[PDB]
Design a protein around this ligand. Structure first.
Ligand SMILES: N=C(NO)NCC[C@H](N)C(=O)O
Ligand SMILES: N=C(NO)NCC[C@H](N)C(=O)O
Ligand SMILES: N=C(NO)NCC[C@H](N)C(=O)O
Ligand SMILES: [Mn+2]
Ligand SMILES: [Mn+2]
Ligand SMILES: [Mn+2]
Ligand SMILES: [Mn+2]
Ligand SMILES: [Mn+2]
Ligand SMILES: [Mn+2]
Lengths: 336, 336, 336
């Protein structure tokens, strides 16, 4: 059989300074420890583990609050380290070779999209999330960076981003028109304001309920990738899925996507042939029971396999086995 | 932004004599103890806690079985106390001001609808429930009052209600044509008989499966509130939701509404502008594990927020924050 | 009211040599121990417990591996014992009288279909399962018989079945065109190859997602039972349902049918009037927590009740109770 993607790269980013619950740094390990790699090879894909990006984690004294942001210099230093590594991987990829990134809290997305856009400036972004993650710093109630990662990247938002020297190299590489959200159900007011003002395509769980996921996917792809010309950066927050199916995550919100709805998003996005980067964020194996962690891990693996082209309707074998070749008598043969 | 309802009243009714499992009396506390009030205020709604109705709970000697009914004089005395309090609240409400009632087992509905109809005689009732709760007393296998509350209220059923002096003030204020059921999946035979005989609109989980919830809501509202002329009494039994999402309740039945389907019912009913009373019944925080109770509580809060107009697609902020007003340099400003 | 089936037979088959996890032999007991029998009688169906089939379980020395198969002589001996008993029951059934079989691992299906086809050679098979269970022996990675049961039965597969004397009486009684799958999401490559090559109708969770269960059922029935002329053998693997709703089973796969989707399959299949045999496979009450076992048991009972005609929209009573006959004064009567 033929594959859309025959090889793929894998990268861990154990960010944990974007939100205060310890454990998202164990995200990549949660996936490495799974049968993910084995299942992908069983499908005929050559998957290369490119290791982990080491985040910059400064101490309290070196990284005081600034404009309410917690760990903002850790954030900016990490953003640039991430961007550099992703850019480098995406350029040696130039059948494309998708990069699979396992986080880590969602604050990594500023860095991953930054680097990705360097290699492929024309990209679009599909943001699968219960949350907007597009708070500008003075509007954030939490001061957690994992709630702001897109705001630094969107050109139309720059008049609401306070200036900092160490953020200078974080160049806004996205237009509002290049992003589509699926799964929203917990926007902060100011996000709603920005999303509506600048016309960012979004499809909330309400849209998913009224339209159905099949149409929502079609609409999202239509909105930001009409003729499949652009590379896709698929940013998948695990908390988009329902807590019944992904409990081990920092900010669970009831009424989420079913696993199946999530698989459909990924299957469709994979099948475009334009999946350039997929990142899975906000796994925290330190949250919930042991069985919660397994449910979450399992959901992540199915989700990630779908992204690489796994087909729930089955895969043909590489060589068809035949009974005679082993010198073995078949029942049909025997009946003579 | 504008709201359909800018204020709202909140009332607890800790009924527990309608069914034998202790704990539904802790229902209202389960919700007060939650972030419900905070979330509602965050949406710009002024919510007034009107306290709890104290139920009449007689002892065994004072309240023997009568026609098989358990605690029927506690029921009738409580029905009148409830009716009086609700009538009083709904008249000082005369942008309507919705009343949110947290139970308590479902037997409270005889009282709440009675009083509600006093203030607004022309109402319709949307009954969201896995059960009919319309057993007449000699047909009830359990003798539990929470399985009979509508039978006393429906005019066409009065020839099957045995007469009791203390029930005289429970005047049948509903026509069969004023009620619509959504969510049914466990009707007793005699309920099925009555529901079909007198032509009560009903939509079972089977209808929900074949029609989809969007159409079922439209049909229900069409059946009992064609042009949105009537006040709506929305009686929401928590056990309508699936046990996976509301386990802490006395008579759980598998195959229920998803949380999302429930939210859609409430969102639609809210958006009519006719939500006059909403009541949530059969929470029992004494049932199930600690995590079961949290799941149930959480579902109740999302459900109740939807009823008051909460929007999963987001809310605009009351004042838009701007970076310059604080004397702060934006990144866009800096780039000159 | 009228019933499609007024009586029914019940048979346990505690197979456990088709897969290595101990406990599927407790399947039938799990259902007998439930309120299943009571609920069915409450619907007006006369259900006769025909006891259990005793499987042949040979020791290691007597049953070595052959062509990789584990316990293949236990399998063949059991297949014939099952076939004989089912044939006998289905002939004394000649309003049909459905046979309800509770397993037991799925390897029993070779025997049950064999015997069923003896009594009703013209049957079709609806296979509800996350798995294909149609591996030929040299293609099986596990060597577990519960993954092969259909391969011995399908005429087009016989050139890939190795001959064994003790399998001679296992006569291939099915054509590829007589089988339809619903629920697939974990086919082995060689199954996919066979299913596509010989044109077996199949509807995976992907089809269920895109088409919706209502259409998938219609298509399946169209594919193998166009004008409802054929008896239906409904082979229901509990692991077709989602692990959230049937956790206690040996090979759980995420992203399954909802309980409701499963009920719809059964309701539709029941309503054809052609439900001849229904079998439920792969219950293992030795797996999972106590609450997992209850969830699974409960799902099985609802599923099996649906198969026998249970209606979620309610059942009429056998005799309508009337208030006057007991010499009792109604409220309506009193108001004169
Ligand atoms: N887990 C997430 N987003 O994906 N949290 C964001 C929460 C909130 N919007 C904030 O700024 O903190
Ligand atoms: N929880 C409920 N209804 O909402 N129980 C009612 C059970 C049954 N119909 C009865 O009369 O007791
Ligand atoms: N539980 C099941 N099928 O229903 N297991 C089959 C697993 C696999 N296809 C095999 O041959 O072992
Ligand atoms: Mn996020
Ligand atoms: Mn999120
Ligand atoms: Mn109720
Ligand atoms: Mn109920
Ligand atoms: Mn099976
Ligand atoms: Mn299976």
């Amino acid at each position: 059989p033929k594959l859309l993607y025959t090889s793929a790269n894998f990268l861990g980013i154990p960010t944990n300074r974007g939100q205060p619950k310890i454990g998202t740094y164990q995200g990549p390990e949660l996936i490495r420890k799974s049968n993910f790699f084995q299942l992908v090879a069983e499908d005929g894909i050559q998957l290369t583990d490119c290791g982990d990006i080491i985040p910059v984690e400064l101490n309290e004294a070196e990284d005081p609050q600034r404009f309410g942001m917690k760990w903002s210099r850790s954030f900016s230093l990490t953003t640039l380290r991430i961007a550099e590594r992703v850019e480098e991987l995406m350029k040696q990829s130039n059948k494309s070779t998708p990069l699979v990134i396992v986080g880590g809290d969602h604050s990594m997305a500023t860095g991953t999209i930054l680097g990705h856009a360097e290699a492929k400036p024309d990209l679009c972004v599909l943001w699968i999330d219960a949350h907007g993650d597009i708070n500008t710093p003075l509007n954030s109630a939490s001061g957690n960076m994992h709630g702001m990662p897109l705001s630094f990247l969107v050109k139309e938002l720059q008049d609401q981003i306070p200036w900092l020297d160490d953020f200078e190299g974080i160049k806004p590489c996205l237009n509002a028109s290049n992003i589509a959200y699926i799964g929203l159900r917990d926007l902060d007011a100011h996000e709603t304001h920005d999303i509506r003002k600048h016309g960012i395509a979004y499809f909330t769980m309400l849209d998913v309920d009224r339209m159905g996921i099949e149409a929502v996917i079609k609409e999202a792809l239509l909105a930001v990738n009409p003729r499949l010309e652009k590379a896709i950066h698929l940013s998948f927050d695990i908390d988009a899925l329902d807590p019944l199916v992904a409990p081990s995550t920092g900010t669970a919100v009831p009424g989420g996507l079913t696993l199946r709805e999530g698989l459909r998003i990924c299957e469709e996005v994979s099948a475009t042939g334009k999946l350039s980067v997929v990142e899975l964020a906000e796994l925290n194996p330190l949250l919930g029971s042991q069985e919660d962690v397994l449910k979450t891990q399992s959901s992540a693996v199915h989700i990630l396999r779908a992204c690489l082209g796994h087909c729930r309707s089955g895969h043909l074998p590489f060589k068809v086995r035949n009974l005679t070749d082993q010198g073995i008598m078949s029942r049909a043969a025997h009946m003579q």
